[PDB]
Write a protein that binds this ligand. Structure first.
Ligand code: ANP
Ligand code: ANP
Ligand code: MG
Ligand code: MG
Ligand code: MG
Ligand code: MG
Lengths: 214, 214
């Protein structure tokens, strides 16, 4: 116990979610940039949730009351990160909401694509997050909700994901989604590509989005 | 939860135990065969403990009342295994007894070796198990005690060990110690080497020891 350093639990994906991930991670698609819109939307949604809570109980904001979104390329590590200081996800949120519960939208989306529907429709089917696998071969979600400890969710779409906990874990409310970019997707590490992509959706989002240039 | 597949926890070694493992795993020594005596002794001790319990409560033996020890080389995987159906180790036994508690024997043994004492004295200092690192670069201990679930302890002597649990875990009371043999220690995979080594200590042990020839 005094010698404990941390724990990793492994979970299977719900069956349809697994099938959707395999579909997305393997598919050719000519418009893979929509992943960024999906991650920014989730960040903005998470900021809404804590913002609304803070309107009745301001103390939920703790020492981080300025709600915003950051986009962070890392050429050395070949990762792109979207971070927010929104509501964050409990352990239960991570397991339930990112893999083990499927709604009818999951199956419908695959049926829609099999019928020549558009991958860019992914958000309309309730599975927007999984668009990250268009451009990435591994995704890591680090999240902290006021009600729980910090956890790291991780998956390379092999049918399972892990949830990792460490006894001193980071204390900052929010979520960081980090994408390990596929060989041919190095263009999303380029600040010029990112800055226009952000501007393209920035119009629709009521929180500052800062691009961190290395 | 219904999707849970298992968990791995990581622990630091007690400081002196870590130092002893580094000493043992790195050291030249001309008589490394004593590791086998140490593992067979532990197996025989574990069989004594359940045997004695069964004398007042025979039902502790369940469906495995014949107490014995097996030695199992595996040339394909380059592993040597010593298995018993003795008392087994609870989760707490594995963490407490194989890494996080040091007695004064640990420090004394290193002081003894620094003074030109013998590595073969290891058993007299209460640290016999760690002799496995003379011949192996990783050790895995799978154990099941009547009072607990099955767990796997694992370490390559890098300062930590892991404890792994799976929700359907094996049900057989006992312990299997598996050694991944170092490059130059392939001779302990040879049945002729093993059979004499066993015979050399078989005289001192009141349980059958069977060598499993591939
Ligand atoms: N940055 C984040 N902060 C907090 N929760 C998040 C974040 N990203 C994802 N989630 C949670 O994960 C769930 C899955 O996200 P996602 O697959 O994008 O679905 P969605 O946003 O609910 N609907 P849609 O994106 O329109 O298909 C969300 O409902 C949130 O509960
Ligand atoms: N096969 C096994 N079955 C059950 N418990 C075991 C087994 N091997 C090791 N142990 C436990 O691990 C502890 C450490 O073993 P070891 O380092 O060999 O010390 P020891 O046998 O107590 N004394 P010694 O070997 O004379 O130095 C033991 O006391 C047992 O509690
Ligand atoms: Mg979304
Ligand atoms: Mg934690
Ligand atoms: Mg011993
Ligand atoms: Mg178990």
């Amino acid at each position: 116990n005094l010698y404990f350093q941390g724990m990793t639990e492994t979970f299977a994906f719900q069956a349809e979610i697994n099938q959707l991930m395999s579909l997305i991670i393997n598919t050719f698609y000519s418009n893979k940039e929509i992943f960024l819109r999906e991650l920014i939307s989730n960040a903005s949604d998470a900021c809404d949730k804590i913002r609304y809570q803070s309107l009745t109980d301001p103390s939920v904001l703790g020492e981080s009351p300025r709600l915003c979104i950051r986009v962070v390329p890392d050429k050395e590590n070949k990762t792109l990160t979207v971070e927010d200081n929104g509501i964050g996800m409990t352990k239960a949120d991570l397991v339930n909401n990112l893999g083990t519960i499927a709604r009818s939208g999951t199956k419908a989306f695959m049926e829609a694509l099999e019928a020549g529907g558009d991958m860019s429709m992914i958000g309309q089917f309730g599975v927007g997050f999984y668009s990250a696998y268009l451009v990435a071969d591994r995704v890591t979600v680090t999240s902290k909700n006021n009600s729980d400890e910090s956890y790291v969710w991780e998956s390379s779409a092999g049918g399972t994901f892990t949830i990792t906990s460490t006894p001193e874990s980071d204390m900052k409310r929010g979520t960081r989604i980090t994408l390990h970019l596929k060989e041919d997707q190095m263009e999303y590490l380029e600040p010029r590509r990112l800055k226009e992509l952000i501007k393209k959706h920035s119009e629709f989002i009521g929180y500052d989005i800062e691009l961190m240039v290395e």
